[model samples]
Target: LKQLNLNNEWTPDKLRQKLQTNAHNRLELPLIMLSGLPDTVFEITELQSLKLEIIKNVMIPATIAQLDNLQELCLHQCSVKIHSAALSFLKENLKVLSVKFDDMRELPPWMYGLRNLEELYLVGSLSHDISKNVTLESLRDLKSLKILSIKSNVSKIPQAVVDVSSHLQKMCVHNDGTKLVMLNNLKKMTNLTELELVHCDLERIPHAVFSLLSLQELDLKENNLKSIEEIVSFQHLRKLTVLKLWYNSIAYIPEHIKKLTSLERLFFSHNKVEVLPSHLFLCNKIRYLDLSYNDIRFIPPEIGVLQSLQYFSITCNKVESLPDELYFCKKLKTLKIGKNSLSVLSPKIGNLLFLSYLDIKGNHFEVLPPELGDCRALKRAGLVVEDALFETLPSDVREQMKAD
Candidate 1:
């Protein structure tokens, strides 16, 4: 009966009699992983499933009247202030409800009747006047939700999460700074496949929500986008593969995004991108391209026509130069051009040959072109710059061009 994991010296009536004696020893126990349970630990009376974590307050009528065989309830970092008749006592054996209130900013209107919820994860930070009487027909009785994640900061787009039209499939919403005006009711769910929208404040992205024909994975990170017509309206999301728009406010990279030929992984890190059009290597089913910390300053010599590019990052861009056809990307291993203003490195950079992790940290390099020590597929080369001039490594290749 090793249940509960409360810290800071448990108290609250000895953590509510050690979780009502581990809910009276099983009793057909389902699953319960609580935390810091003090506020009279939801007097479990045969808990079905629960996974709470550090809840602060909200004495919910002595805790949902001893959760009667709760269906499933996870509340991480909770802080429920208590209202809406203390959440109408979990509208009949909640099916599956996950709450991640970072700091309980709002959302207490009895959480629109559980109606035997069927899976709802609501991360927090919502307040904009709680969407003026929150509509969505007050959750139309949650019609047995399917999987609704409302990671909030509520910036419009909440007609009870677009009225869950068509019995939602998987929806994630985030708008901590506001601005995301129209998603046209998320193209009526249509059996959504996974759509996360973080830090909203969108500038434009309403092609009827990328005409989701059963979207696969589309995470629009840190919103306020600035063009690229929402990744060219996800060319019919042909089973889209992972596309996170990191740190929004993008600057440029459109040029038809190679029609997202079922992209593999494309996270446009940071933002204010500078240059990269060159048909972005015609996407050719990219395999992870995060242009870390944007403001790029050139690198698109058709990016070696991505032959299934392999994990490439322009870490801290504003590139100072490096495109001798980028050593003809032979399925590059992992190259994160650290900081910028590079000094030089084009001795045919040892012909890539699947180069291994190389992050020229904070550049202005004074040297490094001994064909990168004949690259033999370098395996880890970061932050190199300790100028002093020629110091070895010559003997072959015409004595490395007579020590350059």
Candidate 2:
């Protein structure tokens, strides 16, 4: 771990001592959160990665050319002005860059000239003033770019990003509650496989997203989506495996969700859903399912159909009892049904040969099934329940639970 993380350690003497003491054989200086850059920083020519945050009006000196080994640079909320020589060196040497600013105008025009950049992340206000012609046009020069992320309050997709859509394998755009506009250009990214569009205030999934035939993972969080009827459209992307729709008001998952035969993980926590549709169980390949903080009342016996399930959570719901067949999911490792109305836990729960973590707190259980001891993988610390209720277990069972 060749990393030196110093938060505001700016005194020249202290900086000199720490750098000399820690920079003997390291190639990465992961973090340096300060308001200025001392000239001595340029002497660390061995550094391959460097991060600067909260810097103000720091002029990168031409001496930066000395660090020929540097390849990754992160500048968070830094008011930086690069020397012409230093900028040219960066354009030729850097392979990764991350920048976060308060205003879109602060984005360096030189970014378009970095020919070697493979990943770029931009976070800040992207809304431009009508009078300025600020555009990211020359990004096409970054022929090596494969990943791009833009988190800002923009109304539409930046046209410049679409210009290089053919090369990117992963892309993420977080609108920060801006109700995104005209994402139709997303269809042009035929090679993109992972996407995340958060807080876009979308009422429905973009039709253009469905057109990305190669998409494998999709995350649409903190949106205004009330129903996921468009989920059936996902059938076009046969390799898609992960879908996350947390923090929405979705009232029901359409039965067609089972059409996603490749799905392995699904998350719908903090929604308005109240029922567990049987058709959902037919997606037998699912290994992780989260329906926490909903109005759900029961687990259907058909849940056993998900024999591959290993993690399940229905916490903070109104579930009265778990179906006996649920124990048929012998692969389950983590089970969370806390804060529910469950009055009894069946001895069949011991059937989970791999179960390790069980959280049954805030339930109405009169006594936990003694067979819980049969789960050799479960220890006392892994069992979450009222202290008084836990004492009801047989002494030997409790003793076994005490050891790992």
Candidate 3:
């Protein structure tokens, strides 16, 4: 809890006083977000990981290399005003390096010499006239590289990124304005298991992503996707468990979605979907699902087959009634059915022994079922029925509903 958030107002003397007061707090993977480094920082050499953001000066302390055990170094900066000779000392030990070369006219050529680096994240300086370009062979020289994430609006997928594809297990690229150039350079990363491309404005899943046969998690949220096209082969992604596609324009889901037999969490909120295909319920292994802010009008009774479903949400929809199959999801812990057309709940609702949080606000229920009393797990449940109708409920149930 040693977070000193001095948001560019307090004088330097006051800042030093506050830091000195917390002198007992040593750097245990510290994050320094001050405008300039304090002299006391030099007293801490045992740091293993450090992140610097919103810095004023672009120079590391001359003795910084003395922190030989530092395994991670991250800097989101614009310029480098000091001699970089000290960095060679870290070349042998640093495993992760993240840098936003904001003001540099060109990327440091010495990055290629850090053969021990396993993860590298570099975002080219967007304000510069020309992005420092690196050839494919430059990335391949890091024999230990395993994870890489690059973001640049001026550049396309560095065609050379695929040069070290064989050694990478995870990759992320945000080619914001370079979509005109296709990014199928992933055919070489056979062991790739995770990928993320947020706000890349992709309208469809790239054909190359399907080639990553070992992928276990795929996040493509906040894009312009209108729908997920059909997949010809589900055999390539037998291990996928987490699929996040929120904040998109998608209106319908592909039938092939059910083929991902290992899916455990699925999110498609804030979309234009109007129908919930019966096949969606067939993914019985799902533990969490969110379908909020959609135009959905139906949910098939087959949903009860998801006995493993523990958390679910269908808020803000046009559904008229809940399927009787819901009682079969006895393991459900959180249920969100707010802002819908549901008018009645079955007596079997008490069978949900694990249900703790229930939200049914803005519904059309005439009266809550007496069986709700059997739901001892429900510490609170939302309902907006008439005052008289609510008064008819048991004293304990009445108190639970007071949390509206």
Candidate 4:
């Protein structure tokens, strides 16, 4: 009664044999997709999720809709020529449907007909006017949709995207350098918990995007954005936890960023950012932070406030020295602070009883912190310049490293 976890190599004969062996076995498969999904597939009626990727001659018969036990279907990188009748069978009890094809150009009328679909993901080079496929206003037609994600070559917002339902919690859309938001369109998504905008080649954070006060995670990556609009725009979103603004033209983080009381993980790496906002210390709830590959020069004394921080990376900054405040982070676990400008290693670093990892090559601190030996939690120390620091790392083979 185990679930089917078949790969592409599986054949109809193999499935037929499996069905015979475990005729009463569990009625669900986790992942599967093969060439022309043979008619033999409808025989294995007990499947939950199906992934069809890198298959040839994609076509499903009307009987496919009779997969009464199938709940999820995924189609990727295939030139799908599906009949609406076969698709119609999937209309009942089907909770998720995803279509991703590089050559996909059409949005059929049946796509919007699956009223009970809890999640719908469609990605293609669509130019066939998806906006016109459905009705004009209010996505209220699909009553059970809770999540909708889209990426296309199409230009405008489709329809009733935000107003789909009061139940919608997440919406992700791939940006293709087109304006994806409007003031009124966003204001209605009051129940959205997460909103993702990626690879859009946008030059600025859309001024209207911040209106979603209910957003808990906002991801805007792989864009050309230079900066966020203003801090006051986020004052309404107190539940926000994760914020990513990486791979962009961002140069500075405004001081008002501390107002996000619930912020936990923030990534600003691989950008033009130089200065670490001292006000960032006020975001004490942050447990994971990455500011690597930026031109930062200082680690503020207020950094001690990340008491709950378990992972922090500043591997390639211009910071000149270690702050005594860094030791205040009692939970410090992984601190990848190599390639910096530090000239002195403070003995107070030993105060971080949980300090267990580091490297010391590029940041030329000539005198090793004597208290480094006091860090009983030290697990592995990279680039030990002083022989006296050897005791902190339990497994050191200095003679072997140089002798070899």
Candidate 5:
């Protein structure tokens, strides 16, 4: 393994010689090879797991024919020149396959032939130039497939692919730099439980995507979304437990989201959000809430209503003072309130008897309330007031605080 250090660049000839020597030493053992030199290294036949990176071609037929026991194959940053012929060579033993080819403009016709494939991850802008006649007909034979991740610049998802993957449980798609149209066909997958769509230039989330009753986790992070009204369509998704919509253009939390009584985790980080709605705390089932990197200046007193919350974060905001009601959260365990403009911590903070992780770094506070001494459950605290004579903590919390 030491000899295969990726940091040390190896030429095609050196890599070929290394593989030949390694194969001769252990003929039947599972062999894993990492190579940047592609065309010359495909002749080795004994590899069980192959991770080919920075190659210029798709799955080389000669390479596939030799690895009879190959179970996992990863092609990172490679170019698929012959799509069909390459995919046809994938052996039936192949179970896990990950392909990342950004330069290729179209997906080769052979990608759908992996019959024994269980998990397939294809990420790139390659499929954007696929001809209209090129549907996902090849994927019909992959009946055992469970996970499919496609991150590309395609405006629309191929319906044929969605129809064929009836047993698919997870699907992730991201638009590289184009406007992502609504994935209306996703509702057809009754077994799908998780879905993620990022960097899509979408103005509003279509109702069809949110109406998937079986979906438990939904991530729409880093999209062009601008309104809270988009969440109204998700009202029917009672089974949804996790919702992440961070790094969007949204400015406030919509009232309809509070109706999602089953939500356990919610993330609204890196948005233009300035104020968190007081009604958000009414969700009794939410255990995790992340509102980091926003313009919020204060947390509503109603935040204490989230009595079941176990983890909460409000970092990188403009908050100057914490509401006294925060002490009511008896079940709170992790609290991250760093990088804010806070000048004072209410003495009532000692009421949190279950608090464990507290990050109060980069605040303007000069001294900690004496009540902080009462926090017996505190295991980690980021910053505290150094002396009673001073009014604020040090600019660099790590320098003054013993624990970061």
Candidate 6:
């Protein structure tokens, strides 16, 4: 009875008071938009999980084979229509399926016969194919699928889900930035371990994602990559760890990015980056680092060799100072050096003390350091600076960051 997670702020009198107080309990619904289809949601029948959004045309009647503990179904942009007795009770209790549409719709060849589907998501227009000219070539009967996502406006790479290349691990593809996505079949996902290709118009770096080899988390954000010297082909991805090449047009980052020795989250935001390569402070199991907006000017005292650094952002760069060994990284916590070209503010930044989110707003500071009131979990709106440089701290550290 405890599963109402409905969104869009439920209100048709709060979804008819939660469908008449959870009519006979045990319902797991994610109903978003509803232009129709609400026959008291098939009288609950212990519904397990159902999500419907932007409904149109949808019609999975046959009383949805009285739910019988439905196992998770999502229909976004709902143009659905099942009911071959609800597709034989969703090919024997669906595991998870998400289908979205609007390229004049097609993709529903009984969704390649669910057959104990594991997980699948297909969003909008995979290039061409309009209404019943169908697409998504095949899934070889889901064969207990294992997570697949395709956000499309496509140009390529939906090579029929590589026919579940050895049962997929996780794959996401988002295009719609017009064309350029011919990602040459991602080395048949060989046990893929999370891959996201956003925006798509990629210009390079898809050398078949250097043979995934159980890749870890590689998100190629926005695209048209201009050069990463192909990250020296990720030194054979040794169970790589989150690497997101944010927005692209990359300018330089090679020293073979110290061959990402099991890197830990590195995102180069809006590129055209301008140097940081002291062999990128030798990876050192980086714990989330982003070179925001780029054109960096200087920050290496070998960034105190990232002692498992904890979230750092070189915001809007051209930093004019900072390598006092970045105050010896002691597990620092979220520091975003904002709009740079600084004018001194580091009282050795009060040796980090787990600094809790500091942004230092658009630079050229005139006051800000009583050792920034010794970090103490920075507050006052996470101290993004300027209340005239946060009233130059010290009034007992601005009353403990204004009572936090």
Q: Which is the leading candidate under lDDT? A: 2
> For each candidate, what TM-score against the reference?
0.32, 0.88, 0.78, 0.76, 0.76, 0.34
Can you give the lDDT of residue 127 in candidate 6?
40
Residue 355's lDDT within candidate 4 is 67
Candidate 4 local lDDT, residue 126: 55
Candidate 6, residues 84-173: lDDT per residue as tens digits?
Answer: 877777888877777787634534567777668888887776445322233454567768887888787666665665657777778787
Residue 120 deviation, candidate 1, in Å?
5.8
Candidate 6: segments with Cα more than 4 A from true spot: 1-46, 50-64, 68-87, 92-139, 143-163, 171-210, 213-257, 260-301, 304-324, 328-347, 351-354, 357-376, 379-402
The local distance difference test score of model 2 is 0.74
RMSD, one per candidate, in order:
15.9, 4.8, 6.0, 6.6, 6.9, 15.6
Ranked by lDDT, the better of candidates 5 and 6 is 6
The lDDT per prediction is: 0.65, 0.74, 0.65, 0.64, 0.66, 0.71
Error of 6 at 176 (Å): 42
Lowest lDDT 10-mer window, candidate 3? Answer: 20-29
For candidate 6, the clash count comes to 0
Ten-residue segment with the worst summed lDDT in candidate 1?
22-31
Question: Which candidate ranks first by TM-score, i.e. highest?
Answer: 2
lDDT of 4 by residue, 123-177 (tens): 7665546565343234465678776787765445554765563777776777675
Evaluation by TM-score, superior candidate among 1 and 6: 6
Which lDDT value does model 4 have at 281?
A: 69
Clashing pairs in 3: 78-103, 136-160
| Candidate 1 lDDT (Cα, 0 to 1) | 0.65
Q: List the candidate 4 regions with Cα displacement exceeding 4 Å.
A: 1-11, 15-35, 53-68, 77-89, 101-107, 128-130, 133-139, 176-183, 344-348, 356-378, 381-404
